[PDB]
Structures are given as C-alpha cells and as structure tokens.
PDB file of N, CA and C in Angstrom:
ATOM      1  N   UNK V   1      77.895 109.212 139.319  1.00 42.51           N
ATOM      2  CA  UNK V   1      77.650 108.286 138.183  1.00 42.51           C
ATOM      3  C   UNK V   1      78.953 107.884 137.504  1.00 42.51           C
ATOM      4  N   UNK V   2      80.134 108.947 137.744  1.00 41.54           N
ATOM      5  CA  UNK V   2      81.380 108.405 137.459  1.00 41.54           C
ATOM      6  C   UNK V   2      82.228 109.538 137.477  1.00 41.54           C
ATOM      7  N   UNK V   3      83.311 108.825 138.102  1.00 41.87           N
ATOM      8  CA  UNK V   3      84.189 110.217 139.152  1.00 41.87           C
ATOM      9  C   UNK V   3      85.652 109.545 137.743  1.00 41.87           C
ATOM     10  N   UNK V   4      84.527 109.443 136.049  1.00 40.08           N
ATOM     11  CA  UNK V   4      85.623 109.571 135.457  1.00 40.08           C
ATOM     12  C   UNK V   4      85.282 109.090 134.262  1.00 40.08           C
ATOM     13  N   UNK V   5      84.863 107.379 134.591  1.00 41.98           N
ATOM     14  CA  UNK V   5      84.876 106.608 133.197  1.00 41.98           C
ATOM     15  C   UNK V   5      85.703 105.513 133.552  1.00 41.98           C
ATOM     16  N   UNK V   6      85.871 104.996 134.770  1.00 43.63           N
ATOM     17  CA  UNK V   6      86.636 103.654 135.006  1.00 43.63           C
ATOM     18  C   UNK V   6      88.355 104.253 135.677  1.00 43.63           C
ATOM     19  N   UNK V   7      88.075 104.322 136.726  1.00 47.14           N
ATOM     20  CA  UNK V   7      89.277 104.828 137.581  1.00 47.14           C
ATOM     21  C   UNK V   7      88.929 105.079 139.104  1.00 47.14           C
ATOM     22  N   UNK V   8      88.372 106.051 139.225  1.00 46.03           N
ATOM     23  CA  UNK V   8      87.287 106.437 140.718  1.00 46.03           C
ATOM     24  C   UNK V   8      85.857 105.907 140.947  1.00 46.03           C
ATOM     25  N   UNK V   9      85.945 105.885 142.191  1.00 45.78           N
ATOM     26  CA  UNK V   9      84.097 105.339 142.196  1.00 45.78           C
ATOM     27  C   UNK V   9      84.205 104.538 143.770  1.00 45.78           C
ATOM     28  N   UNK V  10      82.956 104.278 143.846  1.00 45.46           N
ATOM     29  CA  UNK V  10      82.866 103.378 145.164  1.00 45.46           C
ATOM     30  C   UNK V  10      81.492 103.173 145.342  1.00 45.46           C
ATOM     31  N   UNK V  11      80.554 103.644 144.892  1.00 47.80           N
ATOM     32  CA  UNK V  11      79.023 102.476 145.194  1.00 47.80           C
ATOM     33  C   UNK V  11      79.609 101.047 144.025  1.00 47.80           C
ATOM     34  N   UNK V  12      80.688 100.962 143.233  1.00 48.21           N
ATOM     35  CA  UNK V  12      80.908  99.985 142.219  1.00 48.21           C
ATOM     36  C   UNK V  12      80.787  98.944 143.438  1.00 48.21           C
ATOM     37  N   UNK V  13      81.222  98.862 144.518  1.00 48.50           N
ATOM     38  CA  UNK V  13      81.505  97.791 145.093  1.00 48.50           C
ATOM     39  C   UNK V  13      80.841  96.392 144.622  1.00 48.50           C
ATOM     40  N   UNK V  14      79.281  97.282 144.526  1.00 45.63           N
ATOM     41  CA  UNK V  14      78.285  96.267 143.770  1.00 45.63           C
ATOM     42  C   UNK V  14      76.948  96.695 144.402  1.00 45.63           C
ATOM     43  N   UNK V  15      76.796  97.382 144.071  1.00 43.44           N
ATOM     44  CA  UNK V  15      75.176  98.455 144.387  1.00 43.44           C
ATOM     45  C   UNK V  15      74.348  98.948 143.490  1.00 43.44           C
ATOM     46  N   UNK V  16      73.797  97.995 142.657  1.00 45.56           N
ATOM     47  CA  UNK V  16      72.643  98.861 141.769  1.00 45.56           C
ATOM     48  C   UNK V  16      71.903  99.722 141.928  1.00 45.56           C
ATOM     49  N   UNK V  17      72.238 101.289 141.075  1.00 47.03           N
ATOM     50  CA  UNK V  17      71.823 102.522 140.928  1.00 47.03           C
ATOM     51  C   UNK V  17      71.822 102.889 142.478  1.00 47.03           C
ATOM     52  N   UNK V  18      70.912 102.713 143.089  1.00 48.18           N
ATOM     53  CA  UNK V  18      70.825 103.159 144.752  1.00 48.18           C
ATOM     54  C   UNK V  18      71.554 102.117 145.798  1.00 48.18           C
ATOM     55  N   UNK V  19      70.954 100.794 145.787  1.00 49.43           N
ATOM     56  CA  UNK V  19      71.942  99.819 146.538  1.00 49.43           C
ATOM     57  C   UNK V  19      71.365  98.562 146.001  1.00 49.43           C
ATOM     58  N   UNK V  20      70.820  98.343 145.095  1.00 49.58           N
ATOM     59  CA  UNK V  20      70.404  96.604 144.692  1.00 49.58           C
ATOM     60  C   UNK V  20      71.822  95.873 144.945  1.00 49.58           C
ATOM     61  N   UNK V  21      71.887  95.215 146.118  1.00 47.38           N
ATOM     62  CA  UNK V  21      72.875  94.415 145.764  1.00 47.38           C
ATOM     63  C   UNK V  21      73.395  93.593 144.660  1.00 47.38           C
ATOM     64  N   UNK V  22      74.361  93.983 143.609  1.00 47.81           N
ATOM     65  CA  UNK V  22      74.801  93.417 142.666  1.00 47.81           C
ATOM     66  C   UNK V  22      75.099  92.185 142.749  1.00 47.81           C
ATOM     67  N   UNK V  23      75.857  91.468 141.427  1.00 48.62           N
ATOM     68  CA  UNK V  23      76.010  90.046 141.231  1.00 48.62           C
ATOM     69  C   UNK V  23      77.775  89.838 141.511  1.00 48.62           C
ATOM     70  N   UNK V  24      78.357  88.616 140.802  1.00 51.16           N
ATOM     71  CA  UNK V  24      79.554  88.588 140.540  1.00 51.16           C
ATOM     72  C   UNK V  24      79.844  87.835 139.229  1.00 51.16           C
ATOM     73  N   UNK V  25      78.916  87.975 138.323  1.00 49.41           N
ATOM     74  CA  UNK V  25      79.134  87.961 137.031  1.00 49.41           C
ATOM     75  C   UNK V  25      79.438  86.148 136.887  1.00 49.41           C
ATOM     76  N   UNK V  26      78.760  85.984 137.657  1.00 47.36           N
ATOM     77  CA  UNK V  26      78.396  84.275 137.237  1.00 47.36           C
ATOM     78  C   UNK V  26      77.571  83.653 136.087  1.00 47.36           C
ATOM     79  N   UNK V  27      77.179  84.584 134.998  1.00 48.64           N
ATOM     80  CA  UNK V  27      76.921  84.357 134.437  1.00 48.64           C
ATOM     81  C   UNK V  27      75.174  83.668 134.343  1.00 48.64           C
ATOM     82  N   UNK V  28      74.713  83.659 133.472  1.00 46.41           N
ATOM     83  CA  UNK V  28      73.419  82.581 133.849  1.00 46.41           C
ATOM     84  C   UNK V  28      74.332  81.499 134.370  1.00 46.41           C
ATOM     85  N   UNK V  29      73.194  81.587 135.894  1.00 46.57           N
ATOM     86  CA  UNK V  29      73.404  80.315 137.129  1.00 46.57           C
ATOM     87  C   UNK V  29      73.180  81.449 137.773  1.00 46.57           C
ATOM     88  N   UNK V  30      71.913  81.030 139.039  1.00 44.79           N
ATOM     89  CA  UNK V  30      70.950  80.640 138.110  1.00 44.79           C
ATOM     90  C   UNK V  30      70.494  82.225 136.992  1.00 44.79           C
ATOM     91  N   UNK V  31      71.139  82.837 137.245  1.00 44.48           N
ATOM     92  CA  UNK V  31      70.978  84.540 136.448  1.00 44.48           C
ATOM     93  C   UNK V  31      72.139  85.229 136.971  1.00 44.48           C
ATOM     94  N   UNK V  32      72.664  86.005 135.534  1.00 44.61           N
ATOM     95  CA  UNK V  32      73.614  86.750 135.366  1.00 44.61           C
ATOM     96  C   UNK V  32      74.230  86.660 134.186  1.00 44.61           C
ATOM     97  N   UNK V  33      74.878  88.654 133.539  1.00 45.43           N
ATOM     98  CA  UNK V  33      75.200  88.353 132.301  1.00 45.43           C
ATOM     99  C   UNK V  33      76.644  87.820 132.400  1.00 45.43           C
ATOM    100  N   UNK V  34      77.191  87.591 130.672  1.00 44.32           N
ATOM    101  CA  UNK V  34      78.219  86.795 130.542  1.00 44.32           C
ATOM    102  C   UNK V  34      79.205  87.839 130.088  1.00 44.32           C
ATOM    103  N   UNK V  35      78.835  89.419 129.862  1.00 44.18           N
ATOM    104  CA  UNK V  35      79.461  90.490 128.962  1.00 44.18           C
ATOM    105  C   UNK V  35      80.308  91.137 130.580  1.00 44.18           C
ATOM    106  N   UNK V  36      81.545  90.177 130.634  1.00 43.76           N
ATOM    107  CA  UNK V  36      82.465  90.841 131.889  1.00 43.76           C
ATOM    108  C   UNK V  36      84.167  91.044 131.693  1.00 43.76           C
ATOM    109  N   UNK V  37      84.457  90.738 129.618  1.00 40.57           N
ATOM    110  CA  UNK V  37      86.200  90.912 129.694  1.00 40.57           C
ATOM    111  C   UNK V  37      86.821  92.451 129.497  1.00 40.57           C
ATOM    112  N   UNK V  38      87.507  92.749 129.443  1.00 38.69           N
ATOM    113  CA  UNK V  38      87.617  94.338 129.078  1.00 38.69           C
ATOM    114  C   UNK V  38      88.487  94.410 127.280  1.00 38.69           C
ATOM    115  N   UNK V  39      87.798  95.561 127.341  1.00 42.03           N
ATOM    116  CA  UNK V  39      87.769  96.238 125.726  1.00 42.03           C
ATOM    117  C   UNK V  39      86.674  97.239 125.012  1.00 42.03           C
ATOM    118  N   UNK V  40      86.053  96.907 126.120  1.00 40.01           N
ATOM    119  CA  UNK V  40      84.543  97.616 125.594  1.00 40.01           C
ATOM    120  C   UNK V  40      84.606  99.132 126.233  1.00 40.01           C
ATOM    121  N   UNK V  41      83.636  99.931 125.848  1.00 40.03           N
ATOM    122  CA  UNK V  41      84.312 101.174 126.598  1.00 40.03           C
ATOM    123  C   UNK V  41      85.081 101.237 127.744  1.00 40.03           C
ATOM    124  N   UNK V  42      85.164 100.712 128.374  1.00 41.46           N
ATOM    125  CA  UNK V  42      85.802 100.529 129.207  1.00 41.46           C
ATOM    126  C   UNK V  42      86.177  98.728 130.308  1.00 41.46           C
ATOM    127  N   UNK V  43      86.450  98.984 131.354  1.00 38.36           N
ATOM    128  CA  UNK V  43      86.402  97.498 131.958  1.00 38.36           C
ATOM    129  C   UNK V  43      85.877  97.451 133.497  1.00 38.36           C
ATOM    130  N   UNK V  44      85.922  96.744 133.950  1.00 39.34           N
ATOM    131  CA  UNK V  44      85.688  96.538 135.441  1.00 39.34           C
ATOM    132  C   UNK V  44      85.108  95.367 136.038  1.00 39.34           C
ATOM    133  N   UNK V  45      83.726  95.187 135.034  1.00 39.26           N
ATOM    134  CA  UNK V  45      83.006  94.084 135.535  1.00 39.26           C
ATOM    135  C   UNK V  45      84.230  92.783 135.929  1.00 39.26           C
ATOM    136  N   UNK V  46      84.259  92.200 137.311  1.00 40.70           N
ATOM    137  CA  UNK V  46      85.346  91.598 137.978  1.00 40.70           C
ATOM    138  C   UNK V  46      84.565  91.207 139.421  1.00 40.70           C
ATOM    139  N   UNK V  47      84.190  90.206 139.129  1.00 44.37           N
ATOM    140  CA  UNK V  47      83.835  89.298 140.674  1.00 44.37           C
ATOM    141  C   UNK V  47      82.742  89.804 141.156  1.00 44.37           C
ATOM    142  N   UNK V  48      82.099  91.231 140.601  1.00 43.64           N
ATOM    143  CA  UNK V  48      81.655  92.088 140.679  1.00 43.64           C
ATOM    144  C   UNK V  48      81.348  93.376 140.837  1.00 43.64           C
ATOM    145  N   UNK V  49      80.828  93.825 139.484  1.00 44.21           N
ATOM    146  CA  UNK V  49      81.154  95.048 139.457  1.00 44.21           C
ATOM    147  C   UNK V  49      79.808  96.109 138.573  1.00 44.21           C
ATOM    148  N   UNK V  50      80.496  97.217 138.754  1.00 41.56           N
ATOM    149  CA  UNK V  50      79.406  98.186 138.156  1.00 41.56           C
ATOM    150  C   UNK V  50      80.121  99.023 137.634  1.00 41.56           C
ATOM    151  N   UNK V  51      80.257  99.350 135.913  1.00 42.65           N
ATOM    152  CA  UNK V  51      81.023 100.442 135.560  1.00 42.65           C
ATOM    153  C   UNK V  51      80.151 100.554 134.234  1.00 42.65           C
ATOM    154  N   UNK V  52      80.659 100.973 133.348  1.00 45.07           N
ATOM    155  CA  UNK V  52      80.260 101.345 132.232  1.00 45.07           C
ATOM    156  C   UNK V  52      80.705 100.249 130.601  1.00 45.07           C
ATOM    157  N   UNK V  53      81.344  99.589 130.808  1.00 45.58           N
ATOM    158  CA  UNK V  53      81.921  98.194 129.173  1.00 45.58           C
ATOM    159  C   UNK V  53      80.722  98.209 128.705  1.00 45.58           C
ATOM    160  N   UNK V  54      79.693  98.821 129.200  1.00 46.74           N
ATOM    161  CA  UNK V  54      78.209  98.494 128.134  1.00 46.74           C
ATOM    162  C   UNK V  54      77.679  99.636 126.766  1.00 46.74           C
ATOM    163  N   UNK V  55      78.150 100.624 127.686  1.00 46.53           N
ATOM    164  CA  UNK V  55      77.839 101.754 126.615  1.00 46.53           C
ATOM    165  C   UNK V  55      76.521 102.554 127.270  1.00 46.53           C
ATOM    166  N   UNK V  56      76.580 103.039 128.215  1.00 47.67           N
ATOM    167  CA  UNK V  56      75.640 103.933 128.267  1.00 47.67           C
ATOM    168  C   UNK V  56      75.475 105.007 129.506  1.00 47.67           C
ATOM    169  N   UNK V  57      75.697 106.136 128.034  1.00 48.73           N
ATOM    170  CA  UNK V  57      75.205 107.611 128.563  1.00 48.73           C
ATOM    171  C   UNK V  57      74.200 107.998 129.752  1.00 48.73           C
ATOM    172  N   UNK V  58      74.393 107.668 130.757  1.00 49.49           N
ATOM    173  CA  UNK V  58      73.467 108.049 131.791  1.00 49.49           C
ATOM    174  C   UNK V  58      74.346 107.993 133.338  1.00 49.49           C
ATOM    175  N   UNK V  59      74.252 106.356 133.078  1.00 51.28           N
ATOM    176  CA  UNK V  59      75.149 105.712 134.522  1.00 51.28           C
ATOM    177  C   UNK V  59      75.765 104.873 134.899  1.00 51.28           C
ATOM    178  N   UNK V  60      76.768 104.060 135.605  1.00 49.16           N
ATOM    179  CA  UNK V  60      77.200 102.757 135.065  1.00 49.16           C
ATOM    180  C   UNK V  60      76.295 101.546 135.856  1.00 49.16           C
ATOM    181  N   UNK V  61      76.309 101.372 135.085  1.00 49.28           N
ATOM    182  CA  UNK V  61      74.878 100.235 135.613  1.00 49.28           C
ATOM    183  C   UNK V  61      76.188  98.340 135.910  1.00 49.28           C
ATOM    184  N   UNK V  62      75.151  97.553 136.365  1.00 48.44           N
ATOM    185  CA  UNK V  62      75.362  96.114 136.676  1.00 48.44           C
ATOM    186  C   UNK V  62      74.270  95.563 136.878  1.00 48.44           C
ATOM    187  N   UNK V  63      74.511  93.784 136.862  1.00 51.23           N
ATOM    188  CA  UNK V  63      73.225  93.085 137.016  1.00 51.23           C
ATOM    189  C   UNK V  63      73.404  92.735 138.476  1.00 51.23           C
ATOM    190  N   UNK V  64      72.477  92.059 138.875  1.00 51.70           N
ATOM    191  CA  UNK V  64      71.952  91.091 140.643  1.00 51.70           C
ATOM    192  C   UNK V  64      72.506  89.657 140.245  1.00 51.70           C
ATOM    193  N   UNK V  65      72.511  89.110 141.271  1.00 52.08           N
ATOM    194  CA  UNK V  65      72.350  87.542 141.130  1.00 52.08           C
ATOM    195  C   UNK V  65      70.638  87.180 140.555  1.00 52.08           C
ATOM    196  N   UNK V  66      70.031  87.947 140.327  1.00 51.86           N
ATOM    197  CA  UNK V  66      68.562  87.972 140.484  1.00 51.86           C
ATOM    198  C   UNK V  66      67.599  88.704 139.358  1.00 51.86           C
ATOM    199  N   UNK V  67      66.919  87.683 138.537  1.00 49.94           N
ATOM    200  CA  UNK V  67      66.386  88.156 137.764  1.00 49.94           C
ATOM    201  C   UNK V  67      64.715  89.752 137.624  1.00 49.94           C
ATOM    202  N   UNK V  68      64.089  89.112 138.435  1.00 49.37           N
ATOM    203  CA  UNK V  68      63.495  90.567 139.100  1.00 49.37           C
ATOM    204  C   UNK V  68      64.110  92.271 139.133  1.00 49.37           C
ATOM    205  N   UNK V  69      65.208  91.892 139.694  1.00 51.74           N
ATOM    206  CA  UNK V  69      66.565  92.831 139.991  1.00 51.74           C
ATOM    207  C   UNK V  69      67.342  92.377 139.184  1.00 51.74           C
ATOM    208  N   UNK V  70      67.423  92.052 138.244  1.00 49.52           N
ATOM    209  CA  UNK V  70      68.094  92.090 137.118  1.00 49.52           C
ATOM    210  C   UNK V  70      69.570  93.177 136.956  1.00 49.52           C
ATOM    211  N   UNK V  71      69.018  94.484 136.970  1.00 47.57           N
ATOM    212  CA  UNK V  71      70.293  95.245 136.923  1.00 47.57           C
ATOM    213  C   UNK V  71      69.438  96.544 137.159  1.00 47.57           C
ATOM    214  N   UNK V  72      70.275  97.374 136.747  1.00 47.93           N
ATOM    215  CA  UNK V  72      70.087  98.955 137.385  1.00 47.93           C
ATOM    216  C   UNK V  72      71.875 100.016 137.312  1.00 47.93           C
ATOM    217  N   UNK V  73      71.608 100.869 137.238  1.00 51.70           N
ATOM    218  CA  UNK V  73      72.952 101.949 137.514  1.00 51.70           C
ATOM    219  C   UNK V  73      73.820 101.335 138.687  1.00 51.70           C
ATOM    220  N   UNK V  74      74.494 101.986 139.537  1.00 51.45           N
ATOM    221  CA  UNK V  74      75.196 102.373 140.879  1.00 51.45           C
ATOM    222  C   UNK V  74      75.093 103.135 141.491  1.00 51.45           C
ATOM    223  N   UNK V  75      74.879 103.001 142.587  1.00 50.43           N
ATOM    224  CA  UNK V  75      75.230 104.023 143.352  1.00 50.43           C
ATOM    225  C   UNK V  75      76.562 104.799 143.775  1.00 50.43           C
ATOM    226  N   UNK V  76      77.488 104.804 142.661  1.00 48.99           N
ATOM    227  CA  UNK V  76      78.591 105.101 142.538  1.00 48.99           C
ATOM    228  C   UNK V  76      78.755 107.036 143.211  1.00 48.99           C
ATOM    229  N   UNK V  77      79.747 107.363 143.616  1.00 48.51           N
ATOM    230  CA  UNK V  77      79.866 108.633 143.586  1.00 48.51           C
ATOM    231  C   UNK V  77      80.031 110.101 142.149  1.00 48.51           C
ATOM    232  N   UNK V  78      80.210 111.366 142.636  1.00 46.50           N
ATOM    233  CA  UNK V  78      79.715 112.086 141.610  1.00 46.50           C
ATOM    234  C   UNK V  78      77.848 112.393 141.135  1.00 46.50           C
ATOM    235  N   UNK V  79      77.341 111.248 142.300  1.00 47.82           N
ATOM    236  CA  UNK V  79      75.761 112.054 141.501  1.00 47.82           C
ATOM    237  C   UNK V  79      75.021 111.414 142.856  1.00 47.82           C
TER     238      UNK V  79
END
C-alpha cells in the first residue's frame, strides 16, 4: 500500500487497488479527476498515477478513464 509515502512502489504504474486499469489524469473528458499538481500530502499523480496527494489512511488510491471504475487503491507493493 506504500513501500513509504511517495518514493517506492510499482502497482502505481496505474492499477486500481488490484489492477483496474487507471487513467492519465485527463481530467473530465470524457471522466477523470483534475486534483494531479504536487503539494498535497504528497505528489505523483503524472500521466498517470496512483499515490496518496489525497489524504487517505488506508491506500493510495487513483481514478480510471471510466466512470463505473471510477477509482479504487493500487495494487502497489508492501500489502
């Protein structure tokens, strides 16, 4: 879930929680969020990504190109 807090990792590639294929932060078009600069706990979201800039205690989550699949964790390493 995080081999840190934004440094290590590798389901980030873009794999929601298990493997939802993630987005690349296109924003709505036709779905996707717009929350991708860094400052926020941390950074990453980048072309696509899955880390934690959101704030939450569990896992680092990302969205899909796809509203259904919306978003979810990573399948990142460590869990």
């Amino acid at each position: 879930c995080k081999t840190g807090n934004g440094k290590n990792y590798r389901g980030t590639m873009s794999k929601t929680k298990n493997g939802i294929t993630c987005q690349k932060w296109s924003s709505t078009s036709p779905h996707r969020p717009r929350f991708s600069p860094a400052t926020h706990p941390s950074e990453g979201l980048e072309e696509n990504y899955c880390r934690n800039p959101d704030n939450d205690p569990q896992g680092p989550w990302c969205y899909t190109t796809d509203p259904e699949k919306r978003y979810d964790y990573c399948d990142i390493l460590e869990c």
